Amino acid sequence: GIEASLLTDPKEVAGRTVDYIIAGGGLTGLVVAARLTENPDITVLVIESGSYESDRGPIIEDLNAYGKIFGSSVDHAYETVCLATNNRTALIRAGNGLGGSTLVNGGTWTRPHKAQVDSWETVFGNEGWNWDSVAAYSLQAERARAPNAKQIAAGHYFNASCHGINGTVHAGPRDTGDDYSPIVKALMSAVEDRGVPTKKDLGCGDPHGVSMFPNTLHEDQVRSDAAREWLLPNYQRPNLQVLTGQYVGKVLLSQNATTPRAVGVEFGTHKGNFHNVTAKHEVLLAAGSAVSPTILEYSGIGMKSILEPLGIKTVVDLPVGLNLQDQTTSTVRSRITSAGAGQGQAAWFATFNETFGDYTEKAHELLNTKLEQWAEEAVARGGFHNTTALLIQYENYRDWIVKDNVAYSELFLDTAGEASFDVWDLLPFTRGYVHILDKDPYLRHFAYDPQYFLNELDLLGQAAATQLARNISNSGAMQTYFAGETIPGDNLAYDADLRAWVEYIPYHFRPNYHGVGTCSMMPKEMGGVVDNAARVYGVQGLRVIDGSIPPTQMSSHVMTVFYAMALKIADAVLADYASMQ
Amino acid sequence: GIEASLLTDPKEVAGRTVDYIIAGGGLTGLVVAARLTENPDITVLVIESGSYESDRGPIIEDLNAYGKIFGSSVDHAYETVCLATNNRTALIRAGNGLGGSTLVNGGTWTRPHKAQVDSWETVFGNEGWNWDSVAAYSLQAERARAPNAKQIAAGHYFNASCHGINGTVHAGPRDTGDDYSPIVKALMSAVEDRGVPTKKDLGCGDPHGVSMFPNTLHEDQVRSDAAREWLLPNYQRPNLQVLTGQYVGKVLLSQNATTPRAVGVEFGTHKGNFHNVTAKHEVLLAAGSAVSPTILEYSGIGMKSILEPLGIKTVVDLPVGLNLQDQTTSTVRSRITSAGAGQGQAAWFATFNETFGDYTEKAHELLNTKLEQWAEEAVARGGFHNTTALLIQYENYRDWIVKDNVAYSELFLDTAGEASFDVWDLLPFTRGYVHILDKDPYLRHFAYDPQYFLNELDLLGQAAATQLARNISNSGAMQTYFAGETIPGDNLAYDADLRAWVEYIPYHFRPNYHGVGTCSMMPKEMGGVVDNAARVYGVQGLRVIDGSIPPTQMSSHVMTVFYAMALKIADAVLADYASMQ
Numbered sequence A, B: 001g002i003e004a005s006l007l008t009d010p011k012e013v014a015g016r017t018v019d020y021i022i023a024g025g026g027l028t029g030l031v032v033a034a035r036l037t038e039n040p041d042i043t044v045l046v047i048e049s050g051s052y053e054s055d056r057g058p059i060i061e062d063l064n065a066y067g068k069i070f071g072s073s074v075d076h077a078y079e080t081v082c083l084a085t086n087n088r089t090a091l092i093r094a095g096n097g098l099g100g101s102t103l104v105n106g107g108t109w110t111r112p113h114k115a116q117v118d119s120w121e122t123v124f125g126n127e128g129w130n131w132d133s134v135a136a137y138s139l140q141a142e143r144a145r146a147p148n149a150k151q152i153a154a155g156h157y158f159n160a161s162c163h164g165i166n167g168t169v170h171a172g173p174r175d176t177g178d179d180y181s182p183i184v185k186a187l188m189s190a191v192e193d194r195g196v197p198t199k200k201d202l203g204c205g206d207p208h209g210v211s212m213f214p215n216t217l218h219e220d221q222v223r224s225d226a227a228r229e230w231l232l233p234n235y236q237r238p239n240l241q242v243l244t245g246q247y248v249g250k251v252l253l254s255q256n257a258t259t260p261r262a263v264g265v266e267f268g269t270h271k272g273n274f275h276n277v278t279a280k281h282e283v284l285l286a287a288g289s290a291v292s293p294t295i296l297e298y299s300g301i302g303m304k305s306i307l308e309p310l311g312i313k314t315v316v317d318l319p320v321g322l323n324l325q326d327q328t329t330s331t332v333r334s335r336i337t338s339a340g341a342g343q344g345q346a347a348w349f350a351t352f353n354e355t356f357g358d359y360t361e362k363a364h365e366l367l368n369t370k371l372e373q374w375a376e377e378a379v380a381r382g383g384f385h386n387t388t389a390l391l392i393q394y395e396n397y398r399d400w401i402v403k404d405n406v407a408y409s410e411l412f413l414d415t416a417g418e419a420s421f422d423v424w425d426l427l428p429f430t431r432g433y434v435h436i437l438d439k440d441p442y443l444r445h446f447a448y449d450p451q452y453f454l455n456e457l458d459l460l461g462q463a464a465a466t467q468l469a470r471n472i473s474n475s476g477a478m479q480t481y482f483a484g485e486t487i488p489g490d491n492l493a494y495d496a497d498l499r500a501w502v503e504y505i506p507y508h509f510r511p512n513y514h515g516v517g518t519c520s521m522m523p524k525e526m527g528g529v530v531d532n533a534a535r536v537y538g539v540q541g542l543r544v545i546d547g548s549i550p551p552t553q554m555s556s557h558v559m560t561v562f563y564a565m566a567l568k569i570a571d572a573v574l575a576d577y578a579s580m581q
């Protein structure tokens, strides 16, 4: 079926010409590939390092098997540098195969705060990029299902004005057919005692409080990975070709005109064993936030201070690979009474004050006085190039916290036999980088440094949000079900104060795998790599269309935005194509 | 050139018949491939997941660049289970290319104790596998160079009787052109004050004390990796063929009324995309100790209790994957005075009593009383299947310590601007396992658990040897160069006792990447997987020829032994070939 359609021999595409080459068959790459080939006259070649996985079995198709895929050939498992905070190497989970990280992710489907997307036009000078336009694309991608009586009784609320029901990505409530645990409504009641809202639709634009949420799965509970949703219904199109098992190494550039033009790519598996293919219109990079910047650097598009010591000639100088923003995740886990049994997920989207509690005043004071110093320190660490322009970002985050009161941390609850919180600070001020370390793309030798916890507010906020997760687990209605803590358990005294949490947290955290910003969409003079149509500055016919481009984090899970962002970009590509006919 | 001669399209190979198929182009695979094709009538196909790397540049060819290749495409970076000792996953460095881990290793060239190799015949019933035979094969493989006057003045000693000079593997002193650091002879002086010997030739069969050693490199310092030494001189042989970029998935077994026979292998990159090739004589597994046991399991050779829940019919029931033995490595590092400058490596091979110091009586008491209890506990953890058979191994270890006084720990010194010890207990009593977790070989979903520190003497021994490295770093003539400790540094009090070291070591160690034992060469009734000619019990025409088969650890670096082991197996394979003509 679809398996027989995939190309595997490099020689069957080498030296030919297509209209668009898409590097990476993941979330954004497959969305754009489908939109472009709706026109039967447009040819698209997707080149993907992995292969088809959607039909493999529960390890892909059951969202409840989350994490068992880690460490396998479907996980790139990119390795960080030796992190300064704890002198350890960390692993970055990332899907390897058609659908990308939508093959391996938690399936959570929520949207950020309206003011966060709006800042993309007001602060980051991106025409047409605002909550209304992005949300309209989001709803157009969405095919959501309202919850039933069982699901509403568990704790779901669904405002139909905030969801599309006619789109492409199937979404609805996760339901294992088991009973839902009462612990979800117990956590809601526990935060209502503190004046915290509950059951806001996290798709409507003000994610705050404790709520349940849809999941990216079909009603029969099969995972809605981007390949199942966007490629499987369309693979029979003769103008849509997919080459699997090959890495895109570099963009081929014209030597001709005033400014360079992308004319194709080189792809392969090892030095001396690579091939060319030509793009008549454009090359679109969709290899993920950890990779698309490295493809640019291997092609001579990046920072001369990085490329010259490797013997790569710089043809376009841009701050490629900087401004990397990922979050830190920690765990609090507790056994539950027999009364707590049942399925169910929920999350507390907590504000700054809700996160810091007693430390709210001191934290606000740091935020009010340290921005300039913090920016100088991040630039000195190589996380950004221009202190003045980084400060624009920090002033924007302070307005989000102080004037808009957006969610600052996320406390994610799993039940199904226990009470377990994964906790992350949503708005890190640290900035990191990814840079190549060799001229050979197929060696994949690079330095990936998110600089976790090298901003003191990031460490304070993470410690405070995790302490809060212990607090709320044994508070209010949650006391009914509390049966003793197992994480941290013995490793951190149960009455630890914030200082004790700060000492513990660097040795008990994982990456959140939400990395954005390595080809930031903002003006060049602000440190950006792409314009408001995702075009790389100073190069014709070349775009970065994936998680590399969001200039900020957001108080949500990213799929709702990335699906919208891919469709918005597809409209721009098609508009430029049309103007030539 | 060798690059053009390599095969890179799987369809050039699919459907052929050759005499021998070697899975894995690593150390032992390439040695056996070279030996077999000395007869121009014998055809060999090597199938290797990586490609050719020996001409890449310093990152491969300069031993002093050790470690920079980690995390690249030339590094398999196998992830362990989440370890019980510290709730972390660890990474197993393992070379991916022609040459295997000889491409990425430290280059150290030493031999174990005579009694340790003798035990393979005496305890583990492997006729012909004793020090005399293995050493003779080792000298035949070896092409050593005596140290010169500058190198002898630095501390080198070389006994011509213990080294071959007319063989294949180039070996001699590392020499970066710098002055040699006086810290090496200082360390020798410091252990001389305690009656510990120095400058013994660690190739002669009694490795004890502080010595320098040869390195696997040419005189101009190019790394002598297995491909450079065994394949590059011989790639023009028409009967020798090498396929790169492809994984061997499983052995093809006849399925009829008679005993199963290896008739070929299936190889490829993904479940949709694999091929066969036929073996007329034998299939030889050489994919490394972490992989060759999994290839057997994928083929239905292994434990029914593992295979059946995965949907794999058990064709031959063997304890495949058990008895895994890897060591734990920790670091002590300090700054040096200006007078300590220069190049130089040395190692202290320390006996049981030397490592334990004032804890010697208590350590000996544990070793005398707990062997049966420990073997029960290792079996209950799944590291081995038969308690009595494991107790035989433990008695052998106790004899090595009490009656032979073999080296028990190794303290490896690097200088070149600092004083840095990597420390490991050489003889772990813990037993681990590796097992597949899915029936699809190309998913590479497996559980690899060395069970580090889950035996209490292993933890106690590693704590004591690392404390000893701190002690000797500031003792005797070493005091002249001591300029402050940086690791542990602030992370552990400088006057910490053994108990304090025991608390810290589980959170400050790495795998040594010396894992052996997963297809142990011993009698079936002792838990073995292969006989003394490396043939898998119960299967015709199938052998395992790599680091999976040594039944014990050894007090040395293993290259001297693995080259000899490969040469000795080649002779057995060629004797069976002559029997069928």
Ligand SMILES: *[C@@H]1O[C@H](CO)[C@@H](O[C@@H]2O[C@H](CO)[C@@H](O[C@@H]3O[C@H](CO[C@H]4O[C@H](CO)[C@@H](O)[C@H](O[C@H]5O[C@H](CO)[C@@H](O)[C@H](O)[C@@H]5O)[C@@H]4O)[C@@H](O)[C@H](O[C@H]4O[C@H](CO)[C@@H](O)[C@H](O)[C@@H]4O)[C@@H]3O)[C@H](O)[C@H]2NC(C)=O)[C@H](O)[C@H]1NC(C)=O
Pocket: A483, A484, A485, A486, A487, A488, A489, A490, A491, A494, B084, B085, B086, B087
């Ligand atoms: C790695 O991570 C794992 C967890 O992921 C850690 O293991 C857990 O450690 C915590 C302690 O930090 C343990 O919690 C304690 O639980 C006991 C009582 O639990 C007993 O009863 C349970 C049901 O009633 C039963 O399921 C348990 O059985 C399991 O555990 C035993 C031994 O742990 C094991 O042998 C079995 O096979 C099962 O796996 C268990 O027998 C309780 O006494 C403790 O209470 C203390 O703390 C509370 C604080 O709330 C305090 O009020 C009390 O006064 C008391 O002092 C504590 O709750 C947990 O059982 C462990 N296992 C699991 C699965 O969670 C492990 O330690 C980590 N390793 C590291 C860090 O190296």
Ligand SMILES: *[C@@H]1O[C@H](CO)[C@@H](O[C@@H]2O[C@H](CO)[C@@H](O[C@@H]3O[C@H](CO[C@H]4O[C@H](CO)[C@@H](O)[C@H](O[C@H]5O[C@H](CO)[C@@H](O)[C@H](O)[C@@H]5O)[C@@H]4O)[C@@H](O)[C@H](O[C@H]4O[C@H](CO)[C@@H](O)[C@H](O)[C@@H]4O)[C@@H]3O)[C@H](O)[C@H]2NC(C)=O)[C@H](O)[C@H]1NC(C)=O
Pocket: A084, A085, A086, A087, B335, B483, B484, B485, B486, B487, B488, B489, B490, B491, B494
């Ligand atoms: C991760 O791992 C690294 C090591 O790789 C850890 O960093 C090292 O920490 C140790 C302490 O645990 C430091 O050692 C101390 O050194 C100071 C003085 O060092 C000064 O002089 C050096 C030249 O002689 C100079 O290179 C140093 O500059 C570097 O380091 C500093 C940080 O220290 C940094 O700011 C710079 O930018 C440079 O990177 C520095 O100027 C010394 O005071 C200490 O002496 C103690 O011990 C002695 C005797 O043992 C005792 O008598 C004293 O009372 C005192 O208590 C100690 O030697 C080391 O400098 C750090 N850096 C290295 C080694 O490069 C890091 O902490 C780890 N992070 C973790 C665990 O999170």
Ligand SMILES: Cc1cc2nc3c(=O)[nH]c(=O)nc-3n(C[C@H](O)[C@H](O)[C@H](O)COP(=O)(O)OP(=O)(O)OC[C@H]3O[C@@H](n4cnc5c(N)ncnc54)[C@H](O)[C@@H]3O)c2cc1C
Pocket: A023, A024, A025, A026, A027, A028, A029, A047, A048, A049, A050, A093, A094, A095, A096, A097, A098, A099, A100, A101, A102, A104, A105, A106, A107, A108, A109, A110, A246, A247, A248, A249, A286, A287, A288, A289, A291, A512, A513, A514, A546, A547, A548, A557, A558, A559, A560, A562
């Ligand atoms: C563990 C985890 C959990 C997550 N959970 C959630 C969640 O609950 N909710 C949510 O909304 N989001 C979640 N996400 C995030 C979401 O899945 C991703 O942000 C999204 O898939 C990223 O899309 P992308 O197009 O930027 O890249 P990806 O989807 O990662 O796709 C990039 C593709 O490029 C391929 N590739 C890489 N290098 C090359 C190369 N050189 N040549 C060719 N192809 C290449 C990769 O194999 C991959 O298929 C999670 C992510 C992870 C890792």
Ligand SMILES: Cc1cc2nc3c(=O)[nH]c(=O)nc-3n(C[C@H](O)[C@H](O)[C@H](O)COP(=O)(O)OP(=O)(O)OC[C@H]3O[C@@H](n4cnc5c(N)ncnc54)[C@H](O)[C@@H]3O)c2cc1C
Pocket: B023, B024, B025, B026, B027, B028, B029, B047, B048, B049, B050, B093, B094, B095, B096, B097, B098, B099, B100, B101, B102, B104, B105, B106, B107, B108, B109, B110, B246, B247, B248, B249, B286, B287, B288, B289, B291, B512, B513, B514, B546, B547, B548, B557, B558, B559, B560, B562
């Ligand atoms: C970091 C490190 C440092 C070391 N330092 C030293 C040292 O200083 N001194 C010393 O004496 N020894 C050292 N060693 C050990 C020594 O290098 C190895 O033990 C030796 O290379 C092992 O030989 P092998 O044939 O068993 O396996 P390997 O040499 O690892 O060969 C296995 C080969 O099989 C390939 N392969 C894997 N899976 C498949 C598959 N499915 N199909 C086909 N091919 C496959 C691999 O890519 C590899 O080429 C070190 C090892 C490591 C990892």
Ligand SMILES: *[C@@H]1O[C@H](CO)[C@@H](O)[C@H](O)[C@H]1NC(C)=O
Pocket: A159, A160, A161, A162, A204
């Ligand atoms: C539902 O969503 C729409 C759009 O945000 C809004 O007008 C309405 O107030 C929301 N709430 C309810 C209860 O309808």
Ligand SMILES: *[C@@H]1O[C@H](CO)[C@@H](O)[C@H](O)[C@H]1NC(C)=O
Pocket: A015, A252, A253, A266, A275, A276
């Ligand atoms: C392939 O890629 C580059 C174009 O920049 C060049 O080396 C070569 O001529 C191209 N064509 C072929 C057939 O290799």
Ligand SMILES: *[C@@H]1O[C@H](CO)[C@@H](O)[C@H](O)[C@H]1NC(C)=O
Pocket: A353, A360, A361, A364, A402, A405
């Ligand atoms: C949060 O805290 C600050 C200072 O403690 C206070 O001024 C502010 O009104 C609080 N509430 C909100 C919603 O920001």
Ligand SMILES: *[C@@H]1O[C@H](CO)[C@@H](O)[C@H](O)[C@H]1NC(C)=O
Pocket: A471, A472, A474, A475
């Ligand atoms: C948790 O937070 C509440 C908030 O008022 C506080 O009263 C309580 O002392 C905190 N600690 C615990 C253990 O509940």
Ligand SMILES: *[C@@H]1O[C@H](CO)[C@@H](O)[C@H](O)[C@H]1NC(C)=O
Pocket: A386, A387, A388, A389, A525, A526, A527
């Ligand atoms: C640094 O950033 C500021 C803010 O965008 C900008 O005005 C200035 O020109 C930038 N400087 C450089 C060298 O890019």
Ligand SMILES: *[C@@H]1O[C@H](CO)[C@@H](O)[C@H](O)[C@H]1NC(C)=O
Pocket: B159, B161, B162, B204
């Ligand atoms: C050198 O090696 C031989 C063989 O082991 C041995 O007899 C001799 O004593 C060794 N030492 C010296 C100094 O020759």
Ligand SMILES: *[C@@H]1O[C@H](CO)[C@@H](O)[C@H](O)[C@H]1NC(C)=O
Pocket: B254, B255, B256, B257, B258, B261, B263
């Ligand atoms: C079974 O297969 C083996 C190996 O392929 C072959 O030698 C033998 O003749 C076969 N036996 C029967 C009964 O077909």
Ligand SMILES: *[C@@H]1O[C@H](CO)[C@@H](O)[C@H](O)[C@H]1NC(C)=O
Pocket: B015, B252, B275, B276
């Ligand atoms: C490969 O082997 C399998 C079974 O061993 C079988 O499908 C086929 O006959 C063989 N050849 C090809 C080309 O698949």
Ligand SMILES: *[C@@H]1O[C@H](CO)[C@@H](O)[C@H](O)[C@H]1NC(C)=O
Pocket: B353, B360, B361, B364, B402, B405
């Ligand atoms: C080692 O220590 C034990 C006592 O703990 C003693 O019997 C033995 O003689 C010592 N020396 C050697 C070389 O074993």
Ligand SMILES: *[C@@H]1O[C@H](CO)[C@@H](O)[C@H](O)[C@H]1NC(C)=O
Pocket: B357, B471
């Ligand atoms: C170091 O080792 C020697 C020899 O056992 C011992 O006398 C001394 O107390 C040890 N400790 C220190 C801190 O030197």
Ligand SMILES: *[C@@H]1O[C@H](CO)[C@@H](O)[C@H](O)[C@H]1NC(C)=O
Pocket: B386, B387, B388, B389, B525, B526
């Ligand atoms: C266990 O091993 C011992 C020693 O080799 C042997 O005598 C015994 O038969 C074995 N038991 C089983 C069940 O294999």
